[PDB]
Design a protein around this ligand. Structure first.
Ligand SMILES: CCCCCCCCCCCCC(=O)O[C@@H](COC(=O)CCC)COP(=O)(O)O[C@H]1[C@H](O)[C@@H](O)[C@@H](O)[C@@H](O)[C@@H]1O
Ligand SMILES: CCCCCCCCCCCCC(=O)O[C@@H](COC(=O)CCC)COP(=O)(O)O[C@H]1[C@H](O)[C@@H](O)[C@@H](O)[C@@H](O)[C@@H]1O
Ligand SMILES: CCCCCCCCCCCCC(=O)O[C@H](COC(=O)CCCCCC)COP(=O)(O)OCCN
Ligand SMILES: CCCCCCCCCCCCC(=O)O[C@H](COC(=O)CCCCCC)COP(=O)(O)OCCN
Ligand code: NA
Lengths: 531, 280, 65
């Protein structure tokens, strides 16, 4: 086939897709090229890796996979790479969709192909091969949210000699109830290109299972171990430093001089020396958070949508620093409006204390729930509430007629807003005709907003909090994972505390005589069956 | 246009030769034009559907609301040219209704549309029951209190007492709004009983019952929103506004090849793709 | 074979599909709209038709007259 829609399709591809074993064997025996890649736009439709071996793997035809891999005529190159660099394992990862049956099929085919590849090429590191994006099959599974195949790979255990080296989970010992497992953490914590934790945590927010992928046993235990080891103390220290920063900023802003036209000449008195020191420290922290936000933007390259569907804390800290810097500019521009900026920064700064509720499970999950409430329930409520408020305020201020100070849309909007906070006067003016119209409008507004809509907000919050327990917990765990990875990247003292329980000898030896050290993580377990 | 209405007496108001008044009268003309548009749209809906006079009050709420908005607009026009300031009374109602009718357009957005459907359900069930019982309690205790109140050496009006007792619902009840009575113990006992029954019991009960309702109208609200959007789709397709023919589908596809006769059969089908990893 | 049995309307002008929709007979409605037959000389009666099957991917055509 030369047509662009089916370009590269061959008789072998058709025979494999039709699940005709005899035709496949006859075509291969007759000289069909097993390396003939199909590059039609349809084969990108249904994607299988542009290779007949990957086609057989992706269609659950194990017999055809074995034949194409180790037939007597022309074996297929297991390390063959398609137009995007993907191998057979990348193709298997790509076709996963985390359903039960597809996950079982992908798991079985992946295991069989990897074992056969080891048997035919014991020297080949099949999983280490990256595609053109630079992703291994494990990194691709993590990047694309293929939680099923990811969980399989990370927990892979094999119980035969000369192929158990492929496994990542290995039972170190079995006593009676006590068992010890070693998980291979190669390219989980550090890979020198991209680790699984880096891929999951720094995903683009469109990954399907980004919140759930960290519930895979070794990753959860690893992140908890890293937290308890060295990140808990560093995080609490950072929280303490931020508390000191905001206390100093609060003190400096509270005792701002009230004379006109800044900048204010420093007086030779102790209180003003402390005040100007506090101002310098406040501006220093603002500059710090400003450059930290720039560093985040450059190191992540957000897609200009991930800024506003994800990474809210970075935006908030950056905006706080922006208010601080605008305050500095207005301060040295001889404008009192710097105060307008400063208080906003101050307000934002204190609300940014909620960022540090992560690292405490109950408070962190609570802050995540606050986020969810703001984004869903408060958003919908505020849209409808503002529609009602503006409509009834316009009606009332139209009805109001000054004669002999209301009749301003702002004042009427404020008076109608007061009903929401339980301070609505209900007789705030008499400057109208048709008192029945005025009171009917106010009563309709009150019934629609105060009695209906606000209690409806309470009810919807109840439904939401009922239906986001696990989601909030997973999001908090992801936030703490991001904290752990950022602390590890910073590391502050050239330390190397990110490593696992040592260069342990997991399986002894590869099929070669060389001994293999894996940098494993030990997990103890107790079981009362399968002794 | 309504905000900048002139405040002189006895409409219609002579147009002044100034820019602001030209903009004002243009806005008023456009407002009345839109009112006429929605009026005739409501008539067209009534004639084309022939509602059974019960389907109006269990269904077609949005058409009735837009029609009533236009009715208020037209009554405002009639009063305006009838030299009555009461046109303002109509106009503001239309204005208020118009802004609430903005919620009609929350359909077409799934979350906001389902939210508006839930608002509808809350109004029809929970607010209805609550308002019946609440108005019974409010009127009863207002009558008792205003009977107890005795003016002279203001209150002792049923309206004022009803308003004062309503203020408790919005968190603004004085609880000592008058002293013009004998038997202060009776007055305070009545007010406390009213507060416990309405503010503490009935309003918090409204919150609880709204929680119970929203817990069990998720799928019903989603289905009703889908039906509303379906009605929107059918009305837009029926109108079509420019003789367009975008209503069609993937084309005259040859589905089965042939009937039992020799004729080739074209069906105008819609294509749906799916993936199945079992039952090969 | 020459008779279009489902096109016959009742006194109200409703075909069996229109009647199923009108009366809320969601079960028979869902059956009719998703009706599929897999034999020659009877598949013309179906409304759901499988246009093609590759491997995991299938394509269906729903008749929506
Ligand atoms: C003038 C005065 C204004 C005061 C305004 C103040 C607002 C509240 C301040 C709250 C501060 C807490 C905070 O620092 O931000 C919180 C909450 O944000 C908001 O709700 C802002 C709403 C706007 C989330 O921060 P995070 O960056 O962790 O985002 C999550 C990712 O981590 C994670 O990977 C997940 O992808 C997840 O989906 C992401 O969300
Ligand atoms: C003086 C100032 C007064 C202001 C008063 C303002 C009230 C609220 C205004 C809300 C406006 C939203 C709207 O436009 O109407 C909404 C809500 O209506 C109400 O709750 C009014 C209560 C009275 C529903 O509109 P709809 O026509 O879609 O009805 C549905 C059908 O579509 C669908 O086919 C189904 O059959 C479904 O069972 C039907 O319901
Ligand atoms: C959800 C809560 C709703 C509250 C209602 C506020 C919105 C109403 C519309 C704003 C109109 C702006 C305005 O025109 O109001 C300005 C006053 O400035 C302000 O104070 C703006 C506040 C910004 C509001 C932030 C949203 C001049 O009118 P004035 O009658 O106060 O002039 C007095 C000078 N002798
Ligand atoms: C749920 C909320 C409950 C609020 C209570 C309202 C119902 C009470 C009974 C109405 C009685 C009508 C009346 O008689 O009140 C009128 C006042 O007109 C009005 O303002 C009627 C408003 C219509 C109410 C719409 C529902 C003359 O009495 P007045 O004591 O105010 O005369 C003073 C003139 N110097
Ligand atoms: Na109050």
């Amino acid at each position: 086939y030369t047509d662009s829609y089916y370009k590269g399709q061959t008789a072998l591809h058709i025979a494999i897709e039709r699940r005709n074993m005899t035709l496949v064997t006859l075509l291969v025996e007759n000289g069909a090229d097993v390396q003939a890649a199909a590059n039609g736009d349809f084969f990108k439709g249904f994607y299988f890796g542009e290779l007949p071996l990957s086609l057989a793997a992706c269609t659950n035809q194990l017999a055809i996979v074995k034949f194409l891999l180790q037939n007597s005529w022309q074996p297929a190159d297991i390390s063959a790479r398609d137009s995007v660099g993907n191998t057979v394992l990348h193709a298997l990862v790509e076709v996963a969709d985390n359903t039960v049956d597809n996950t079982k099929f992908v798991t079985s085919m992946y295991n069989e192909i990897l074992i056969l590849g080891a048997k035919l090429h014991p020297t080949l590191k099949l999983e280490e091969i990256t595609n053109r994006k630079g992703l291994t099959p494990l990194a691709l599974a993590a990047s694309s949210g293929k939680i099923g195949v990811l969980a399989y790979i990370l927990q892979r255990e094999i119980h035969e000699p000369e192929c158990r080296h492929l496994s990542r989970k290995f039972t170190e010992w079995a006593y009676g109830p006590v068992h010890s497992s070693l998980y291979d953490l190669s390219c989980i914590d550090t890979c020198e290109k991209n680790s699984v934790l880096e891929v999951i945590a720094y995903s683009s927010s469109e990954t399907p299972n980004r919140h759930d992928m960290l519930l895979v046993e070794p990753l959860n235990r690893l992140l908890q171990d890293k937290w308890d080891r060295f990140v808990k103390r560093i995080f609490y220290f950072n929280f303490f430093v931020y508390c000191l920063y905001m206390i100093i900023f609060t003190a400096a802003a509270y005792y701002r001089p009230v004379e006109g036209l800044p900048p204010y000449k420093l007086k030779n008195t102790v209180g003003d020396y402390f005040r100007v020191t506090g101002e310098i420290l406040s501006v220093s922290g603002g500059v710090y958070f400003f450059f930290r936000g720039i560093q985040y933007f450059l190191q992540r390259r957000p897609s200009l949508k991930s800024l506003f569907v994800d990474s809210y804390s970075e935006i908030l800290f950056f905006v706080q620093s922006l208010f601080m810097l605008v305050s500095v500019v207005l301060y040295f521009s001889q404008r009192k409006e710097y105060v307008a900026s400063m208080v906003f920064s101050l307000a934002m700064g204190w609300t940014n204390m909620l960022y540090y509720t992560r690292g405490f499970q109950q408070m962190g999950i609570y802050a995540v729930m606050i986020e969810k409430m703001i984004l869903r329930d408060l958003c919908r409520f505020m849209f409808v509430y503002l529609v009602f408020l503006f409509g009834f305020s316009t009606a009332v201020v139209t009805l109001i007629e000054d004669g002999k100070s209301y009749n301003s849309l702002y004042s009427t909007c404020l008076e109608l807003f007061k009903f929401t906070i339980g301070m609505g006067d209900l007789e705030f003016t008499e400057n109208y005709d048709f008192k029945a119209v005025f009171i009917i409008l106010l009563l309709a507004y009150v019934i629609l907003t105060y009695i209906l809509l606000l209690n409806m907000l309470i009810a919807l919050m109840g439904e939401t909090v009922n239906k986001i327990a696990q989601e909030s917990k997973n999001i908090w765990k992801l936030q703490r994972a991001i904290t752990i990875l950022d602390t590890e990247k910073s590391f502050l003292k050239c330390m190397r505390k990110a490593f696992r329980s040592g260069k342990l000898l997991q399986v002894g030896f590869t099929p070669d005589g060389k001994d293999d050290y894996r940098w494993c993580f030990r997990v103890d377990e107790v079981n009362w069956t399968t002794w």
